[PDB]
């Protein structure tokens, strides 16, 4: 199946970030009932709290105030129908 | 071993390219005797001719006049001591 509207599982998509600025990780999904986990390689899981990090199923994750900690390989993961899907983004600066 | 001074085998390094401008794929090597192949995913092999594409072991591949065909995942491959090494670059625009 396809939980992510745009899926970059093999080669990451590049997105530009600016520190102090909003960073959208744009892994929007095909249904609002899909649960998505955001990860930063290799160790971190970023939990949305509805403020500093907001999940919107039509957009992806919205990180209000990006920092240098958000520079790297970021992965959205969703498990649907018992299967795990990943889509990958490489963030670096403007 | 390590034929490439900087080696990006697992997560590609990002490099900015501008069309009509020089593009360096910077997979410099640890010895001028190392043979390196340049590839563009998934089908292409780019052959240096000493003019449009120049190999310099201290720099990498120098593509005089980059085009949109050079946008994508580019890989330098070297076989040393019977082992194949790869280093990966994602090119996209300035
Ligand atoms: Zn960039």
Author numbering:
A (entry chain X), B (entry chain X): 132 to 225
What did the authors write?
Three receptor types have been highlighted: VEGFR3 (also called Flt-4) regulates lymphangiogenesis, VEGFR2 (KDR/Flk-1) is the primary proangiogenic receptor, whereas VEGFR1 (Flt-1) has been proposed as a regulator of VEGFR2. In this study, we showed the presence of a metal site at the dimer interface of X-ray structures of human VEGFR1 domain 2 (hVEGFR1d2) solved in the presence of different divalent metal ions. The three structures are similar and reveal a homodimer with interlocked hydrophobic surfaces buried at the interface and a divalent cation chelated by four histidine residues (two from each monomer). Importantly, the dimer interface involves residues that lie in the core of the hVEGFR1d2 surface that interacts with VEGF-A, VEGF-B or PlGF.
Although the presence of a ligand was not observed in the crystal structure, we observed the unexpected presence of one metal ion characterized as Zn2+ using X-ray fluorescence spectrometry. Contrary to the Co2+ and to the Cu2+ ions, the Zn2+ was not intentionally added in crystallization conditions, but was a posteriori identified by X-ray fluorescence. A zinc contamination arising from laboratory items cannot be excluded or from the putative ligand Laxaphycin B. This cyclic peptide does not possess the peculiarity of some Zn2+ chelating peptides as Cys residues, or thiazole and oxazoline rings. The Zn2+ ion adopted a regular tetrahedral coordination geometry and was coordinated through the Nε atoms of the imidazole groups of His147 and His223. The metal ion coordination site is octahedral for Co2+ and tetrahedral for Zn2+ and Cu2+. The mean estimation for ΔG dissociation was 12.7 kcal.mol-1, 58.1 kcal.mol-1 and 18.4 kcal.mol-1 for (hVEGFR1d2)2-Co2+, -Zn2+, and -Cu2+ respectively. Zn2+ and Ni2+ exhibited IC50 values within the micromolar range. To evaluate this hypothesis, a model of hVEGFR1d2d3 was built, oriented as in the VEGFR2d2d3 template and positioned as observed in the Zn2+ hVEGFR1d2 dimer structure, followed by a GROMOS molecular dynamics simulation performed in the presence of explicit water molecules and NaCl. The homodimeric model retains the d2 dimer interface and the bound Zn2+ ion after a 2 ns molecular dynamics simulation.
